[PDB]
Amino acid sequence: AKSKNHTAHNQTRKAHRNGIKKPKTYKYPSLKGVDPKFRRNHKHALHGTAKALAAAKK
Template identity: 80%
Template sequence: MAKSKNHTAHNQTRKAHRNGIKKPKMNKYPSRKGLDPKFRRNARFAAMGTQKAVAAAKAAVASGHINVSFFLLALGFECKRNMAAYSILEQA
């Protein structure tokens, strides 16, 4: 007796392309579930520290204790061309 056919891809590509082959949806911020716990813990503390530092800088600039350009120099910006960081401090 002859062996029977096991598999064929006939018509499968046509069916797949009728609605278009789409890339899987990607989230802007992927879930951190299942990520390394040590990394997650450190990221949380780093974010809190960053928020505290920005708040302290805004308070210092608002009270006049520190100059905005001096603060930008301390952060590592040579000039005011980096308007993103500059605008954050100017809003304080």
């Protein structure tokens, strides 16, 4: 009672029914996988520029 093993028929038509879509890019993307040494300094860089503008519009 052998059956049919595998086929790719109707697979491209099914994928195009709802359409293949873009990954919906955003501004300020996720920082997963970035260098931890660079990210440790960037956290302090934003801390110093937040209080700099706080002392400019005090």
